[PDB]
Coordinates of C-alpha atoms and ligand atoms in Angstrom, one line a residue:
Chain A
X10 CA 149.8 125.3 111.2
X11 CA 147.2 126.7 109.2
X12 CA 148.5 124.5 106.2
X13 CA 149.3 121.4 108.4
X14 CA 145.7 121.6 110.1
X15 CA 144.0 121.6 106.7
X16 CA 146.2 119.0 105.2
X17 CA 145.4 116.5 108.2
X18 CA 141.7 116.8 107.6
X19 CA 142.3 116.3 103.8
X20 CA 144.4 113.1 104.5
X21 CA 142.0 111.9 107.3
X22 CA 139.1 112.2 104.9
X23 CA 141.3 110.1 102.2
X24 CA 141.9 107.6 104.9
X25 CA 138.4 106.9 105.7
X26 CA 137.5 106.8 102.2
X27 CA 140.2 104.2 101.4
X28 CA 139.9 101.9 104.6
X29 CA 137.2 103.2 106.8
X30 CA 137.1 105.1 110.1
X31 CA 138.5 102.2 112.2
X32 CA 141.9 102.4 110.0
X33 CA 142.7 105.8 110.9
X34 CA 146.3 106.0 112.8
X35 CA 148.3 109.0 114.1
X36 CA 151.4 107.4 113.1
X37 CA 150.3 107.0 109.5
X38 CA 148.7 110.4 109.0
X39 CA 151.8 112.1 110.7
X40 CA 153.9 110.1 108.1
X41 CA 151.6 111.1 105.1
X42 CA 151.7 114.7 106.4
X43 CA 155.5 114.7 107.0
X44 CA 155.1 115.8 110.7
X45 CA 155.8 114.6 114.1
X46 CA 152.9 112.3 115.6
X47 CA 152.6 115.0 118.6
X48 CA 151.9 117.7 115.6
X49 CA 148.6 115.9 115.1
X50 CA 147.8 116.5 119.0
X51 CA 148.8 120.1 118.5
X52 CA 145.7 120.8 116.2
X53 CA 143.2 118.1 117.3
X54 CA 142.6 116.8 120.9
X55 CA 142.2 113.2 119.5
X56 CA 141.6 111.1 116.4
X57 CA 137.8 111.3 117.3
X58 CA 138.1 115.1 117.0
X59 CA 139.9 115.0 113.6
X60 CA 137.1 112.7 112.5
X61 CA 134.4 115.3 113.6
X62 CA 136.1 117.8 111.2
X63 CA 135.9 115.0 108.4
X64 CA 132.2 114.7 109.5
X65 CA 131.7 118.3 108.9
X66 CA 132.7 118.1 105.4
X67 CA 130.4 115.1 105.2
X68 CA 127.6 117.1 106.3
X69 CA 128.5 119.8 103.7
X70 CA 128.3 117.2 100.9
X71 CA 124.9 115.9 102.3
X72 CA 123.6 119.5 102.5
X73 CA 124.4 120.1 98.8
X74 CA 122.8 117.0 98.0
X75 CA 119.5 117.7 99.8
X76 CA 119.4 121.3 98.6
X84 CA 107.2 123.1 97.5
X85 CA 103.5 122.3 96.7
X86 CA 104.0 118.5 97.2
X87 CA 105.7 118.1 100.7
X88 CA 105.5 114.3 100.6
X89 CA 107.4 114.2 97.5
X90 CA 110.0 116.5 98.8
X91 CA 110.4 114.2 101.8
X92 CA 110.7 111.4 99.2
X93 CA 113.2 113.2 97.0
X94 CA 115.4 114.0 100.1
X95 CA 115.2 110.4 101.1
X96 CA 116.4 109.0 97.8
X97 CA 119.2 111.6 97.8
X98 CA 120.2 110.2 101.4
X99 CA 120.1 106.6 100.0
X100 CA 122.4 107.7 96.9
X101 CA 124.6 109.4 99.2
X102 CA 124.9 106.2 101.6
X103 CA 125.7 104.3 98.3
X104 CA 128.1 106.7 96.9
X105 CA 130.2 107.5 99.8
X106 CA 129.8 104.4 102.1
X107 CA 132.8 104.8 104.5
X108 CA 132.1 108.7 105.1
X109 CA 128.6 107.9 105.7
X110 CA 129.3 105.2 108.2
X111 CA 131.9 107.5 110.1
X112 CA 128.8 110.0 110.6
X113 CA 127.3 107.2 112.8
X114 CA 130.3 105.5 114.2
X115 CA 132.2 108.6 115.5
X116 CA 132.1 109.1 119.3
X117 CA 129.2 111.8 119.4
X118 CA 126.3 111.8 121.8
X119 CA 123.3 114.0 122.7
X120 CA 124.4 113.3 126.4
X121 CA 127.8 114.8 126.2
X122 CA 129.0 118.1 124.8
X123 CA 128.2 118.9 121.2
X124 CA 130.3 121.5 119.6
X125 CA 128.4 124.5 118.2
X126 CA 129.5 124.3 114.7
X127 CA 128.8 120.4 114.5
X128 CA 125.6 120.9 116.3
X129 CA 124.5 123.7 114.0
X130 CA 125.4 121.7 110.9
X131 CA 123.3 118.7 112.0
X132 CA 120.4 121.2 112.9
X133 CA 120.4 122.8 109.6
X134 CA 120.2 119.2 107.8
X135 CA 117.0 118.6 110.0
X136 CA 115.4 122.0 108.9
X137 CA 115.2 120.7 105.3
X138 CA 113.1 117.7 106.6
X139 CA 110.9 120.1 109.3
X140 CA 109.8 122.3 106.3
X141 CA 107.7 119.9 104.2
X142 CA 106.5 118.3 107.7
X143 CA 105.0 121.8 108.8
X144 CA 102.8 122.1 105.5
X145 CA 101.7 118.3 106.1
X146 CA 101.2 118.9 109.8
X147 CA 99.7 122.4 110.0
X148 CA 98.5 122.2 113.5
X149 CA 101.7 120.8 115.2
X150 CA 104.0 123.0 117.4
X151 CA 107.7 123.0 117.0
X152 CA 108.4 120.1 119.7
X153 CA 105.8 117.9 117.8
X154 CA 107.5 118.8 114.4
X155 CA 111.0 118.2 115.8
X156 CA 109.9 114.6 117.2
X157 CA 108.4 113.8 113.8
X158 CA 111.5 115.0 112.0
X159 CA 113.6 112.7 114.2
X160 CA 111.2 109.9 113.6
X161 CA 111.1 109.9 109.9
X162 CA 114.8 110.5 109.6
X163 CA 115.5 107.7 111.9
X164 CA 112.9 105.4 110.0
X165 CA 114.7 106.3 106.5
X166 CA 118.1 105.7 108.1
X167 CA 117.0 102.2 109.2
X168 CA 115.8 101.2 105.8
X169 CA 118.9 102.3 104.3
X170 CA 121.3 100.8 106.9
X171 CA 119.8 97.3 106.8
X172 CA 119.3 97.3 102.9
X173 CA 122.7 98.5 102.2
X174 CA 124.4 96.1 104.6
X175 CA 122.3 93.3 102.9
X176 CA 121.0 92.2 106.2
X177 CA 118.5 89.1 106.1
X178 CA 115.9 91.7 107.8
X179 CA 116.6 94.6 105.4
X180 CA 114.6 95.5 102.2
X181 CA 116.3 94.2 99.1
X182 CA 118.7 96.7 97.2
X183 CA 116.7 96.8 94.1
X184 CA 113.6 97.8 96.3
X185 CA 115.1 100.8 98.5
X186 CA 113.9 103.5 96.5
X187 CA 110.5 102.0 96.0
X188 CA 109.9 101.1 99.7
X189 CA 111.0 104.7 100.9
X190 CA 108.4 106.1 98.5
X191 CA 105.9 103.8 99.9
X192 CA 106.4 104.6 103.4
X193 CA 106.6 108.4 103.1
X194 CA 103.5 108.7 100.9
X195 CA 101.5 107.5 103.9
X196 CA 102.7 110.3 106.0
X197 CA 99.9 112.6 107.1
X198 CA 97.5 111.1 104.3
Chain B
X11 CA 125.9 66.3 123.9
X12 CA 127.0 68.1 127.0
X13 CA 130.0 70.2 125.7
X14 CA 128.1 71.5 122.5
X15 CA 125.3 72.7 124.7
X16 CA 127.9 74.0 127.4
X17 CA 129.7 75.9 124.7
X18 CA 126.4 77.8 123.7
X19 CA 125.5 78.6 127.2
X20 CA 129.2 80.1 127.7
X21 CA 129.1 81.9 124.5
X22 CA 125.8 83.5 125.5
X23 CA 127.3 84.4 128.9
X24 CA 130.3 86.1 127.3
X25 CA 128.3 88.0 124.9
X26 CA 126.0 89.2 127.6
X27 CA 129.1 90.1 129.9
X28 CA 131.5 91.8 127.4
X29 CA 129.8 92.0 123.8
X30 CA 130.2 90.0 120.6
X31 CA 133.7 91.4 120.0
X32 CA 135.1 89.8 123.1
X33 CA 134.2 86.3 122.0
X34 CA 137.4 84.1 121.9
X35 CA 137.9 80.2 121.3
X36 CA 140.7 80.3 123.8
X37 CA 138.7 81.8 126.6
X38 CA 135.6 79.7 125.8
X39 CA 137.6 76.4 126.0
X40 CA 139.1 77.4 129.2
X41 CA 135.7 78.1 130.7
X42 CA 134.2 74.8 129.4
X43 CA 137.4 73.0 130.4
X44 CA 138.1 71.6 126.9
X45 CA 140.8 72.1 124.2
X46 CA 140.2 75.0 121.7
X47 CA 139.9 72.3 119.0
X48 CA 136.8 70.9 120.8
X49 CA 135.1 74.1 119.8
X50 CA 135.8 73.8 116.0
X51 CA 134.6 70.1 116.4
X52 CA 131.0 71.3 117.1
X53 CA 131.0 74.7 115.3
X54 CA 132.9 75.4 112.0
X55 CA 134.0 78.8 113.4
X56 CA 133.1 81.5 116.1
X57 CA 130.6 83.0 113.5
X58 CA 128.7 79.5 113.6
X59 CA 128.7 79.5 117.5
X60 CA 127.5 83.2 117.3
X61 CA 124.6 82.0 114.9
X62 CA 123.5 79.7 117.7
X63 CA 123.5 82.2 120.3
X64 CA 121.4 84.5 117.9
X65 CA 119.1 81.6 117.5
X66 CA 118.2 81.7 121.4
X67 CA 118.0 85.6 121.0
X68 CA 115.4 85.1 118.2
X69 CA 113.5 82.6 120.6
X70 CA 113.6 85.4 123.2
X71 CA 112.2 87.8 120.8
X72 CA 109.5 85.4 119.7
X73 CA 108.4 84.9 123.3
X74 CA 108.2 88.8 123.8
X75 CA 106.2 89.4 120.7
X76 CA 103.8 86.6 121.1
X77 CA 102.5 87.8 124.6
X78 CA 99.0 88.8 125.7
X85 CA 90.6 94.0 114.6
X86 CA 93.2 96.5 115.9
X87 CA 96.3 95.7 113.7
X88 CA 97.8 99.2 114.0
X89 CA 97.8 98.7 118.0
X90 CA 99.4 95.3 117.5
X91 CA 102.3 96.5 115.3
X92 CA 102.8 99.3 118.1
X93 CA 102.7 96.8 120.9
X94 CA 105.0 94.4 118.9
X95 CA 107.4 97.4 118.3
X96 CA 107.4 98.6 121.9
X97 CA 108.3 94.8 122.9
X98 CA 111.3 95.2 120.3
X99 CA 112.3 98.6 122.1
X100 CA 112.1 96.9 125.5
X101 CA 114.3 93.9 124.3
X102 CA 117.0 96.3 122.9
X103 CA 117.2 98.2 126.2
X104 CA 117.1 94.9 128.5
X105 CA 119.4 92.7 126.4
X106 CA 121.7 95.2 124.5
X107 CA 124.7 93.1 123.8
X108 CA 122.6 90.0 122.6
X109 CA 120.4 92.5 120.6
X110 CA 123.6 94.0 119.0
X111 CA 125.0 90.5 118.2
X112 CA 122.0 90.0 115.7
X113 CA 123.0 93.1 113.7
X114 CA 126.8 92.8 114.1
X115 CA 127.5 89.0 113.2
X116 CA 128.8 88.3 109.9
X117 CA 125.4 87.6 107.9
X118 CA 124.5 88.7 104.3
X119 CA 121.7 87.8 101.9
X120 CA 124.4 87.5 99.1
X121 CA 126.4 84.8 100.9
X122 CA 125.1 81.5 102.4
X123 CA 122.5 81.8 105.0
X124 CA 121.9 78.5 106.8
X125 CA 118.4 77.4 106.3
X126 CA 117.5 77.0 110.0
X127 CA 118.7 80.5 110.8
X128 CA 116.7 82.2 107.9
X129 CA 113.5 80.4 108.7
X130 CA 113.7 81.4 112.5
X131 CA 114.1 85.0 111.5
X132 CA 111.2 84.5 108.8
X133 CA 109.2 83.2 111.6
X134 CA 109.5 86.5 113.6
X135 CA 108.7 88.4 110.5
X136 CA 105.2 86.3 110.1
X137 CA 104.1 88.2 113.4
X138 CA 104.6 91.6 111.6
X139 CA 102.9 90.4 108.3
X140 CA 99.7 89.2 109.9
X141 CA 98.2 92.6 111.0
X142 CA 99.9 94.1 107.7
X143 CA 97.8 91.8 105.7
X144 CA 94.7 93.1 107.7
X145 CA 95.8 96.8 107.1
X146 CA 96.6 96.2 103.4
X147 CA 94.0 93.5 102.1
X148 CA 94.9 94.6 98.4
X149 CA 98.5 93.7 98.7
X150 CA 99.9 90.5 97.3
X151 CA 102.5 88.2 99.5
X152 CA 105.3 90.0 97.6
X153 CA 104.2 93.5 98.6
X154 CA 103.4 92.4 102.2
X155 CA 107.0 91.1 102.6
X156 CA 108.4 94.3 101.3
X157 CA 106.1 96.5 103.6
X158 CA 107.3 94.1 106.5
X159 CA 110.8 94.5 105.9
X160 CA 110.1 98.6 105.3
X161 CA 108.4 98.9 108.6
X162 CA 110.7 96.5 110.7
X163 CA 113.8 98.6 109.3
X164 CA 111.9 101.8 110.3
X165 CA 111.3 100.7 113.9
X166 CA 114.9 99.4 114.0
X167 CA 116.3 102.8 112.9
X168 CA 114.3 104.6 115.6
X169 CA 115.5 102.3 118.4
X170 CA 119.2 102.2 117.2
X171 CA 119.6 105.9 116.7
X172 CA 117.5 106.5 120.0
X173 CA 119.5 103.9 122.2
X174 CA 122.7 105.1 121.0
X175 CA 121.7 108.8 122.2
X176 CA 122.9 109.8 118.5
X177 CA 122.6 113.6 117.8
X178 CA 119.9 112.8 115.0
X179 CA 117.8 110.3 117.1
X180 CA 114.5 110.5 118.8
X181 CA 115.0 111.3 122.7
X182 CA 115.1 107.9 125.1
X183 CA 112.0 109.2 126.9
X184 CA 110.2 109.7 123.7
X185 CA 111.0 106.4 121.8
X186 CA 107.5 104.6 122.6
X187 CA 105.7 107.8 121.6
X188 CA 107.4 108.1 118.2
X189 CA 107.0 104.3 117.4
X190 CA 103.3 105.1 118.2
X191 CA 103.1 108.2 115.9
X192 CA 104.8 106.5 113.1
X193 CA 102.9 103.4 113.2
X194 CA 99.4 105.0 113.6
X195 CA 100.1 106.5 110.0
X196 CA 100.4 103.1 108.3
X197 CA 97.5 102.2 106.2
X198 CA 97.0 105.9 105.7
Ligands
STE1 C1 106.3 97.4 112.5 C2 106.4 96.5 113.4 C3 107.7 96.0 114.2 C4 107.7 95.1 115.1 C5 109.1 94.4 115.6 C6 108.8 93.2 116.4 C7 108.2 91.9 115.8 C8 109.2 90.9 115.8 C9 110.5 90.8 115.7 C10 111.0 91.0 114.3 C11 112.6 91.3 114.2 C12 113.5 90.3 114.4 C13 114.9 90.7 114.4 C14 115.5 90.6 113.1 C15 117.1 90.6 113.3 C16 117.7 90.8 112.0 C17 119.2 90.6 112.0 C18 119.8 90.5 110.7 O1 119.1 91.1 109.8 O2 120.8 89.8 110.6
STE2 C1 111.8 111.7 106.1 C2 112.9 112.6 105.6 C3 114.2 111.9 105.5 C4 115.3 112.7 104.7 C5 116.5 112.8 105.1 C6 117.3 113.5 104.1 C7 117.4 115.1 104.3 C8 118.1 115.6 105.5 C9 119.5 115.2 105.8 C10 119.4 114.7 107.2 C11 120.8 114.1 107.5 C12 121.0 113.8 108.9 C13 122.3 113.0 109.0 C14 122.9 113.1 110.3 C15 124.0 112.0 110.5 C16 124.1 111.5 111.8 C17 124.4 112.4 112.9 C18 124.3 111.5 114.2 O1 123.3 111.0 114.5 O2 125.5 111.1 114.6
CL3 CL1 133.4 106.7 101.4
CL4 CL1 122.7 91.5 126.6

């Protein structure tokens, strides 16, 4: 059970990496794990729940990637690591945004904490840039700038006709963030 | 002439009712009272019919953005119009980003030109804000800010745990855009 639970998370991560989030099937994972398909449902409520565990690991990788007198430079460096991550782990990266997870519904504490912890890396330099801003103001700015970088990265990496060209993604993130708070 | 236009009218109605993923040649042909082959006679594939519907969505966007020296306020107003559109026409809005369309592959000239015409509305105030920037620099900044607003709207409307809250989307679009031109 302890071994099986871990083995299923390992295999789920492997599948997402190979063929994407949409390719994950209970029959196939059970076959790879050498268990009954119902053994998957003994450890996770559904495939979405198993995907959240994979996303837990993806957050950990992102947190390692992200990690003081130049706060705009810190924001840029972190954004460049986000871009590099998205490029390096495209399918795991897309699973973070494609899994069923909403601010409306129940967010599990471990999951909500991991995401809150990533956001604190962005809020630190923003507090230096905006010394007069309160926590609500800082939280809103963190969400705005993160959402902005994600948009640049999403449209650019998808090669959409509206996005910034691939070769200019790093440069354009810099140019956007340099302007933040003068 | 009647059937080509009727197929576009019907494809738009289907996308609005059930989303891009629900679009089928068999069902469209049934509604239009034609054979499935009559669809492929007017459009190479469903992708091509989807581009025609997206063409109408661009025209909807163009009308909303054109409505009536404060270029930062113009960017904010246009961005607010983009937010409103995304909330009001969520399925047609998603079809613009979900259709198979890359800058690597063939982009039909009429389609690229229509999207470029929308971008010219953003570039005009950007040229006032950044008078020292050349055309290349302005196009990259147009792409960067569009992508930033889109990220804000996308993660906000999807109620993602990393997004700016629904009730705060307009405010954060304002707080992002006022910082442009530092
Ligand atoms: C910073 C100002 C942003 C203002 C946005 C509103 C202005 C006009 C609309 C421009 C966006 C058109 C939609 C582009 C859709 C792209 C779909 C794709 O890349 O395939
Ligand atoms: C403006 C600075 C942006 C820098 C971002 C990189 C540094 C911090 C990491 C933030 C990672 C958040 C990833 C959240 C994944 C999506 C979760 C969700 O909304 O479903
Ligand atoms: Cl991956
Ligand atoms: Cl719609």
